[PDB]
A paper describes a structure:
Streptococcus pyogenes serotypes secrete two multi-modular endo-β-N-acetylglucosaminidases, EndoS and EndoS2, that specifically deglycosylate the conserved N-glycan at Asn297 on IgG Fc, disabling antibody-mediated effector functions. Amongst thousands of known carbohydrate-active enzymes, EndoS and EndoS2 represent just a handful of enzymes that are specific to the protein portion of the glycoprotein substrate, not just the glycan component.
Our EndoSE235A-Fc cryoEM structure revealed a 1:1 EndoS:Fc complex in which EndoS engages a single Fc protomer through a protein-protein interaction formed by the EndoS β-sandwich domain and the Fc Cγ2-Cγ3 joint, while the EndoS GH domain engages the Asn297-linked glycan on the same Fc protomer. In the EndoSE235A-Fc complex structure, the Fc region is located at the cleft of the “V”-shaped structure of EndoS, between the GH and the β-sandwich domains. Altogether, EndoS in complex with the Fc region exhibits a narrower cleft between the GH and β-sandwich domains than does unliganded EndoS due to the presence of the substrate. The cryoEM EndoSE235A-Fc structure shows that loop 6´ (residues 312-324) of the GH domain interacts with the C´ β-strand and the BC loop of the Cγ2 of FcP1. In addition, both loops 4 and 7 of the EndoS GH domain also interact with C´E loop of the Fc region. The trisaccharide interacts with residues of loops 2 and 7 of EndoS in our cryoEM EndoSE235A-Fc structure. The β-sandwich domain interacts exclusively with the Cγ2-Cγ3 joint of FcP1.
Residue numbers in the entry:
A (entry chain C), B (entry chain B): 237 to 443
C (entry chain A): 48 to 987
The structure:
Amino acid sequence: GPSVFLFPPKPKDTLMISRTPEVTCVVVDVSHEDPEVKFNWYVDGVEVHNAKTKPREEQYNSTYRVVSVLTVLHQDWLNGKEYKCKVSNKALPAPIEKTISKAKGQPREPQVYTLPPSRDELTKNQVSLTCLVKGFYPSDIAVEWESNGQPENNYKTTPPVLDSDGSFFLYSKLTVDKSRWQQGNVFSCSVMHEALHNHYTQKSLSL
Amino acid sequence: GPSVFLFPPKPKDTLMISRTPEVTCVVVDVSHEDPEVKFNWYVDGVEVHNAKTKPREEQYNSTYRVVSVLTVLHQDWLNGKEYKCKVSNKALPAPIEKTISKAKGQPREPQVYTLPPSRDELTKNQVSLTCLVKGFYPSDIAVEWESNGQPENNYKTTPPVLDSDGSFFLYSKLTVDKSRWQQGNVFSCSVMHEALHNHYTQKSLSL
Amino acid sequence: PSIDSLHYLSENSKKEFKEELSKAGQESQKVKEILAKAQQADKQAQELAKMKIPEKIPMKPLHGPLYGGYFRTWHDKTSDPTEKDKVNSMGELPKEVDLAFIFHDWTKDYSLFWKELATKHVPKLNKQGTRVIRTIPWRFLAGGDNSGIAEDTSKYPNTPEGNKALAKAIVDEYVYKYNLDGLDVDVAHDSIPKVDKKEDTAGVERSIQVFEEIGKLIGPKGVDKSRLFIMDSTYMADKNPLIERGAPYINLLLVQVYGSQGEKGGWEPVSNRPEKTMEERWQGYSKYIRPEQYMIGFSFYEENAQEGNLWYDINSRKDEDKANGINTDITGTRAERYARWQPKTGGVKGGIFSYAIDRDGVAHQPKKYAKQKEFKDATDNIFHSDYSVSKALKTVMLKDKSYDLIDEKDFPDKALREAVMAQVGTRKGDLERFNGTLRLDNPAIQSLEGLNKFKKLAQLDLIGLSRITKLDRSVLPANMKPGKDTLETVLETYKKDNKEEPATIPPVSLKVSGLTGLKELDLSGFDRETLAGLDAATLTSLEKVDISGNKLDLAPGTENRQIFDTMLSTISNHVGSNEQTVKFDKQKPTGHYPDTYGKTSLRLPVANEKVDLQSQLLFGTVTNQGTLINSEADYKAYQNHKIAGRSFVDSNYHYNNFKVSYENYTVKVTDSTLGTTTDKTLATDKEETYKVDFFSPADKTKAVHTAKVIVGDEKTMMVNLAEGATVIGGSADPVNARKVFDGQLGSETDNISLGWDSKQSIIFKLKEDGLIKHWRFFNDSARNPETTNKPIQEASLQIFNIKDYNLDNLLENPNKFDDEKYWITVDTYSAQGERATAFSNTLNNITSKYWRVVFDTKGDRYSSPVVPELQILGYPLPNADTIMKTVTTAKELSQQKDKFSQKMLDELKIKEMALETSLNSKIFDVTAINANAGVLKDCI
Ligand SMILES: *[C@@H]1O[C@H](CO)[C@@H](O[C@@H]2O[C@H](CO)[C@@H](O[C@@H]3O[C@H](CO)[C@@H](O)[C@H](O)[C@@H]3O)[C@H](O)[C@H]2NC(C)=O)[C@H](O)[C@H]1NC(C)=O
């Protein structure tokens, strides 16, 4: 029997109010015997027929992945509305239903702060400028780095981590030279987060 | 058929000798009325019969799961000895084997830098004292927050974000009252990790 | 139509309708329906106030095996007629249902169900004989968490008067409200009185008391015995807080273990055996209640049975009949076994019950399911049940000869018959199953005919039937002689590899007294052990007796032998004792081990021999009659034991047969060096004193005997100076490190790694003064004979060089004193490369109250010092500091061969010899040290 999995949009899209989140239901491990998949979308649990099926993607186990994508309202999604994928196939005793939503709870704004290396830290050769984004709810959030208004790539950003107070937290470290990170240069961490206030946050950095 | 999952001990448990490090291999997958389960666990390829199969702590109906927990000496886990449990039961075609150990790879000393709270963190009721620990291999490590020489429970950590040097990294933020943060009694980030001196370290903080 | 002006709606239902108000608090169209339904509910409520409830007519006493049932009120078509899937009616339950467990689950206040009970279903149940008992949760009756009426802590305090009020209100509301016929208590920990999921002791006791007062108002002990007192719980009795306090008040006890787990119990790997077995439960209740008082419940297949509840405990729907939610074949149903199921011990069951009684007739979902979520016919398809299955099963049980009533054809003596009924019961099956005490005190009993029928009886008191005249097996309970259970299981349990069950039947306790008219007493060939229970003084008319072939120790002098001598004297004074009138022989006494042994020491010379420890030391078999047999010759004296001039024992029980074995019992040797052995062989080639612990095969912790093997000269026992050590400065964690000094060897699980270094150190002071002569450290192999921790390749003991360093300074700055400059190396271990579970070495009368040792695996490459246990050896010696100071002073002066003359030197040599003897002695004698010190200070 085939299997169905419902994925949400990219975190930045659901994490900036300007963007349009969508739920796409891709069915994997779908055997030749029961290849047919019928899709029903649902916004906030209400069945919707605006899902759009993409061409199938064959898996490495000689199975196919078949996807139907339905657009959701960004604020609806961030508010915990349920995007639901109903998958129908001849191998199932009944249609399969799956539901997803934003993390429940009052959203908490991410506070984003970029700090340069500690004097002990900047004593290294490649000092890191770190933007910690904390107090963020629901955990759904996205962060990115930049320096002098230009994106900084020598950076790794951790996934949001649900804090002990129900919000989420994370850190992103942009590695520069301790010559450069402490050279003197303004970095800006730009965040678009469903957990961010106005689905955005900023972190300033300097030597 | 059933399936086995082996969970290493908490990095602190494996890092504080006052604790008793242990990996727990539990089987909860396909099972039957036949309850015989000859749980078998190995270490470095040598199977140890001895064990303490947890008394079923299930409160009431519908939890027929058996979990075995094997305590391991630090010098044995640490030496990267590979504990593999092969569990045989009549419902199973043959014993199922799964191995866990101290992670392979050159240990890498964490580099610790302290960051004081962001000003918004003091605008927050809870301000965050941050310890960034980077360049640590393997990813297993224990960090903790304390204040006034006394532990601070209002602390949160992050997953071991693989460093670009193959080690893992994270930031930890101890939260305290912004009034307490303003009158910050001496805090200490105490870390037990083999990559630490005396596999144990304290980082100071004060107002 | 406001909800505050409805009059007839209960304040609860009103609180509900106003919470429903808050939701959609202003929606124009839903504020209508909520008020229109609060209204229609008020119309129903007043229809509930004006009905004419049927008067409760007297109901015939419940007699014989019963069939009860818990009917899901949510599954009744009249509870809420709006739910059209429910089409069955509990009034359709057949007459084969002996007991009607009124379930109040999912019935509104305005619900038709109450009226349907009162006016239709309650009358019919009466007219058919079905009595209705309402069940409530312990939470319903205790606690405040959703305790309903019990929430009113003012209306019902946890006080005597408060409890009385709570009881009156509860009985009114749930029993008197409908003039109900019984009270049932759910005991499921879920139903247990809870508040924030926390035990309310006042709640528990107060519910005990309020049920007890209701049982003073209803039930067997109550004002209204017509109302019953039932008690059913999922919890095992030993966890029923109300078991103890409610037993005396309860009328009925119900218990349903529906499912394979309840039938067979669960499985524990720790004991590798079944747990929570049926017999365990019935026994637990027996600690509180009579098996007649016991009724068991099974489960029909309930609609929409989810995991857990979907027990399929009865026959399931056939796989082919995928749309057939009814399957009626009980043949091979686990419930079939239940209908046949009777508790192996104790007695006959009170009867049977059914959980989800409202599901009689509906099949269980086939196992080829539960992967489907939205598809379930047998489980989740609605059917209208005629309860036909319930009828079939109840009739099947009702046709069990096992429940046949005990009758006068069983006990011809109407006195004896009535007395049995009074003390045992009325079912014939009881007698085969009755496993209790039997007090027979009516002198009117002229004959014991039928007493043979008692198969399982626990005790039997014949306490005054003077009219009975002869006593033999035919009038002696079946349990009279020893035996094993003969009751075959009717339980279709899940035990498969555990397929043996003789269940040795303990021979019944036969108390006999006031059988004044008893003339013939035949207990021969009963394999009986003692005469206990026989009021020999009461068998005044005794004329014939035969007790041959018992298991009784008739060796002269026994209390058994005493009664036998009395009886023999009675016979020799009545008609003369002779080989015809009296028989006692063919005993096969079972030897038990003695409780204590007196040989606390075994002395042998120092020779290159070897000795079997147990044989020389572990010995003796005492009789339950106290007959101590301690040798083959002792058994030969038992062979020489004569009764009436000849033995009373079976000629076949050879001493071997007679002998009990102490093999498989272990030993723990312990030489004077606190070294230990476990060879029953012991070689006297070494002059040593060893301490021997006897362990049963059954226990290696509490010694059955302790002993002192002594090859050559006795040695003072050493002492674990390590016991009570004060942890001092060392690499090892002092908190953990004390564990090595912890006296106990410790478990395998316990950690024995001192420090994260091939060599790791630990200082520690000793508890008290002593004379130190040796030390020892356990390798992990002691903990587990097979450990991967490498052994200490080299180690060292040292003391703080207090002679050169101020011990006060050390105590002030222990970390500062972490230098061997502060220390004095005193001993050093060095492994030569042989496997060993521990190392030990003597000590030259060491003195430092503080010590500091390092161990060393010498394993460089991340091999850390791990030491199992720390052993410091010596004797207790007060004033060790001062005495050892005197000893070193004596050493120094004895070196000062220029300072003292030969005449002083001779006394000094005598004194030094004394100190030498004193170095390892147990009684500290500082006097000689002081006298020598005075002589020396005079000489200085
Ligand atoms: C765990 O085992 C029990 C016993 O086999 C399962 O049976 C019974 O399930 C019903 C329906 O869920 C429970 O009834 C409700 O319980 C609440 C407790 O607050 C009570 O207020 C309601 O009036 C109603 O009776 C019942 O407690 C439960 N136990 C018994 C002895 O009947 C139970 O369902 C199993 N667990 C789950 C989650 O299903």
